[PDB]
């Protein structure tokens with residue numbers, strides 16, 4: 001437990017810096033403000049909030065092995081975590097659908113999407129995530145029934161997560177599993193379109209002059225998110241379907257593995273040459 | 283005082299509202315530039331497409347298109363071509379049956395068209411705009427090949443060692459000699475294009491006559507691929 | 521034909537030394553230097569764009 | 571008859587060199603350097619849907635007019651950043667704009683080979699076309715208002731002409747250039763004007779007599795911009811070979827060259843300050859530079875544009891500098 005504090009401090013600093021750099025780069029320069037960039041700033045803001053007000057308290061609670069702030073602050077922390085995770089995951093699905101519309105139908109992309117519709121979509125996503133997180137927690141619709149939960153609820157030095165099976169399943173389904181199928185279908189269709197378009201160039205001018213460019217990008221984009229957030233949303237359902245199967249430390253480790261995905265996001269969605277020039281400017 | 287300021291603000295608001303209304307219809311239209319050599323046949327093409335400067339409005343599949351021809355003005359140094367660096371595509375019309383005639387004394391008109399296309403392709407401002415190429419006057423070319431004391435070898439030396447490509451789809455009524463001559467002219471233009479391409483723009487060759495009615499379809503399908511390839515390259519999947 | 525006449529007309533023109541022209545230009549620039557808002561920044565109360 | 575022309579050219583060249591007593595560099599060696607000049611943007615005008623190719627200031631330093639290729643002609647109010655008018659255009663290809671000295675009329679032109687005049691101050695109505703000036707073979711490149719009734723235009727058919735707005739007729743025409751004419755600028759007293767063409771030459775016409783007077787052949791590439799020194803006895807030129815030169819009417823030869831090894835891009839516009847000490851020129855590399863006239867030493871740089879700069883102007887009172895670019899934005903400096 002010597003270098004763990006340094007490692008977590010480095011994680012927090014990297015998350016914060018990688019988010020603020022993108023935020024100021026988008027806000028300062030007018031040429032980067034497009035329809036697509038409005039989703040990236042929302043994702044960056046969600047990741048920044050998660051890195052600011054979620055992981056430091058968790059790190060402190062892990063180090064001290066106790067909670068010294070009260071019940072209200074522990075519940076507030078948990079709601080914030082569920083909200084920032086839920087509001088961060090769905091922006092990826094929104095971006096995937098945007099790319100699907102842009103590539104599949106190019107003559108209707110300009111008319112289909114406008115600034116007002118983008119703002120409406122962002123507001124709807126944030127409202128849905130907030131409704132998922134803040135309401136069922138503060139109203140106490142998730143607390144368990146066994147004696148361990150009752151013992152931990154009635155004292156101010158215990159901060160542990162306990163939920164019933166139904167709420168865990170509902171939260172997992174709304175937060176993770178639903179966007180996954182949409183993203184997979186969208187990216188498969190985009191890959192099909194890219195391959196069908198690349199075949200025509202070979203058919204036309206092949207003798208005067210594959211699919212290794214789309215494969216790398218799609219693999220990175222899908223694999224990072226899937227490997228970061230897949231095990232947690234399996235063990236979350238497993239440990240409530242049949243208890244006495246998963247240890248706590250495994251749960252915390254997988255949840256924290258999911259956490260760091262917020263730091264890898266700017267390294268994937270901000271590699272454009274314009275973004276690189278803007279970063280080099282500052 | 284504020285009496286004039288209120289009226290000024292109202293006028294500015296009305297102007298801004300009108301500009302916002304006009305931007306929506308401006309951003310949802312496609313512009314094309316029609317280029318061609320002398321006596322190529324671009325006027326017939328634009329006349330069938332419709333049904334100082336020459337402009338045309340036409341709509342296909344609920345998509346607004348704007349094709350405009352530029353006056354020749356007897357200009358050999360095109361200083362006005364830097365304006366047209368934001369068009370969707372460029373339509374190039376060439377007469378493939380004009381290999382034998384000579385423009386007063388110079389190379390044959392086919393060689394003149396090749397020089398113009400090479401200069402057009404390698405331009406500082408047109409380093410992104412794609413080209414749609416129409417090889418007009420197909421029926422006259424067949425008559426010259428099928429009969430007459432005119433040989434492409436005499437005017438073009440490279441035709442001696444040229445062989446028909448395997449990946450060809452000749453028409454059922456095409457003669458074996460005509461297919462050889464039609465393709466040789468086609469790869470002359472493609473050869474210039476492939477070498478200088480940065481992968482930012484491509485060339486689309488077509489065979490055209492003065493009677494076919496699918497030309498407006500070819501512009502529609504080819505202009506759809508131009509935008510789609512742009513999006514794929516931007517997102518780094520092409 | 522026309523070019524010969526044009527150059528003949530342009531050949532006979534009075535010319536002065538370069539030193540005189542340079543001196544006149546520098547004298548004008550020095551004389552009109554005080555009243556130039558771009559050479560000498562104007563007070564912040566004077567300029568209407570600030 | 572080419573021998574006579576060659577002999578006359580040789581005689582002219584010999585006569586020009588004999589009057590070069592010294593150079594401007596030696597005379598202005600003891601002048602105190604101007605120093606460093608820094609300007610900051612004060613206003614930014616928005617509302618153009620495409621690139622901007624023209625701009626002109628009014629006689630009163632408040633109002634200015636800009637032209638774009640989306641088919642619009644917007645009149646601004648730089649003091650408060652308020653749009654006053656917006657004139658739709660019949661042709662979307664426009665390359666020039668002008669503002670009449672009295673402010674009553676505004677002119678425009680482009681690839682349609684036609685110059686149009688709009689009557690701004692109309693009784694119980696809106697802005698509408700007052701006259702269309704036709705009969706010019708090539709695309710227009712520039713146009714300036716001599717008076718409320720006359721106008722001078724230049725096109726790409728190697729000629730310039732003087733019109734009469736009331737009747738729409740060509741009072742006189744000027745010929746002699748062997749290439750496309752790119753710009754022009756009138757004298758302060760509107761008695762003479764100059765023109766730079768694509769054959770790397772500049773001439774000095776006479777409005778009343780309608781004949782050329784002098785010819786200057788300093789540049790190596792084509793000419794893109796011409797301006798007149800506040801005094802009226804000199805002018806500056808900008809070319810595509812990344813150099814600017816200062817010519818003199820009385821001495822009839824070049825005086826100075828404004829070139830640097832770092833810059834390898836052409837000049838799109840030039841202009842002078844009111845005192846005639848600073849020479850500001852646009853460039854193809856998205857920014858503008860300030861050149862000291864008397865010492866040919868750069869004294870500043872204006873870098874705030876995201877695309878190529880296409881126009882440049884300075885107010886009559888010498889209080890601001892307006893620039894336009896291909897990103898559909900205007901900026902006012904200092």
Ligand SMILES: Nc1nc2c(ncn2[C@@H]2O[C@H](COP(=O)(O)OP(=O)(O)OP(=O)(O)O)[C@@H](O)[C@H]2O)c(=O)[nH]1
Pocket residue numbers: 318319320321322323324325326418419420421422491492493
């Ligand atoms: N028989 C036949 N005539 C054709 C064909 N294509 C073009 N033409 C001839 O072309 C004539 C009109 O086209 P052009 O003479 O090239 O005039 P243009 O179309 O304005 O071309 P430019 O003058 O170069 O601008 C028609 O009168 C036809 O006789 C063709 O496929 N078959």
Ligand SMILES: CN[C@@H]1CCc2c(ccc(O)c2O)[C@H]1O
Pocket residue numbers: 081082085086161168171172175236255
């Ligand atoms: C301990 N932190 C919480 C616990 C459960 C949970 C998370 C995130 C999204 C969900 O849908 C959840 O059900 C985690 O961030």
